[PDB]
Design a protein around this ligand. Structure first.
Ligand SMILES: NS(=O)(=O)c1c(F)c(F)c(S(=O)(=O)CCc2ccccc2)c(NCc2ccccc2)c1F
Ligand SMILES: [Zn+2]
Length: 257
């Protein structure tokens, strides 16, 4: 029932998910001036050489690219993390226009979209148990701006016509997520939450400072997806982002400068 409209969007979520008004909600505005450089933070370690993609899925509010996480393949560690987090899936949030789309903002600046690479803490054994823990997930957020195409995203864009509507899926093997990363791994990090229902407060957010560039034609294809299922009135999948939430009693830390 929740979604992104006037009647079921982010401002309504608290009625079914009271944690929406909780103490460590995401996304947030990253105030670059008050983010403290933390010389104790490590370089982030992103090991995606063995990643195995399985499927791509329109789940009715984004598209997910899913990975086989049953072995220790694609892992995120280092950075602020005390453990080993395993890649499970990635997805995006984007706008109806280039001027909006991202969930995190940087000195109130909105990017055209934001990629989330979602990983779960291997000390909890699986994703479903990890989300019940305050250090259960690590989500790597990467901003998208519109400019030159990202060659490494084109395979994703090209398959979207095949999962236009909610609940459609498609085989999606041998996709290499290393092709979606920017050159620098400088990052901001803070404790936060899933940004859609159930809004669980289980996420260490690591947001890269350097955005990737995608082309206007690439992001236009994201906007041709549908929130509705096949045979229902067409509602374009756009603006599936939650606005910035109160920082409350949290410090955003920077890995750089
Ligand atoms: N935007 S996000 O990165 O914080 C996020 C959520 F907000 C979130 F609620 C979830 S969820 O699985 O608990 C609910 C549904 C969902 C699915 C895909 C994108 C956004 C929300 C995931 N988890 C992603 C996920 C999906 C399937 C299997 C494992 C992880 C998730 F990654
Ligand atoms: Zn997300």
């Amino acid at each position: 029932h929740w979604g992104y409209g006037k009647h079921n969007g982010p401002e309504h979520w608290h009625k079914d998910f009271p944690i929406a008004k909780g103490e460590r909600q995401s996304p947030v505005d990253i105030d670059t001036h008050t983010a403290k450089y933390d010389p104790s933070l490590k370089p982030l370690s992103v090991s995606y050489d063995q990643a195995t993609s399985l499927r791509i899925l329109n789940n009715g509010h984004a598209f997910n690219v899913e990975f086989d996480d049953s072995q220790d393949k694609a892992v995120l560690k280092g950075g602020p993390l005390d453990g080993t987090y395993r890649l499970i899936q990635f997805h995006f949030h984007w706008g109806s226009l280039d001027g909006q789309g991202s969930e995190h903002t940087v000195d109130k600046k909105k990017y055209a979209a934001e990629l989330h690479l979602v990983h779960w803490n291997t000390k909890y054994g699986d994703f479903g148990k990890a989300v019940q823990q305050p250090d259960g997930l690590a989500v790597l957020g990467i901003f998208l701006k519109v400019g030159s195409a990202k060659p490494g995203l084109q395979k994703v864009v090209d398959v979207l016509d095949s999962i236009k509507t909610k609940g459609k899926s498609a085989d999606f093997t041998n996709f290499d997520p290393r092709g979606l990363l920017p050159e620098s791994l400088d990052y901001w990090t803070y404790p936060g939450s899933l940004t859609t229902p159930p809004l669980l407060e289980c996420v260490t957010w690591i947001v890269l400072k350097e955005p990737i560039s995608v082309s206007s034609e690439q992001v236009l294809k994201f906007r041709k997806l549908n929130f509705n299922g096949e045979g229902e009135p067409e509602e374009l999948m756009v603006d599936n982002w939650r606005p910035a939430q109160p920082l409350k009693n949290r410090q955003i830390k920077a890995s750089f400068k």
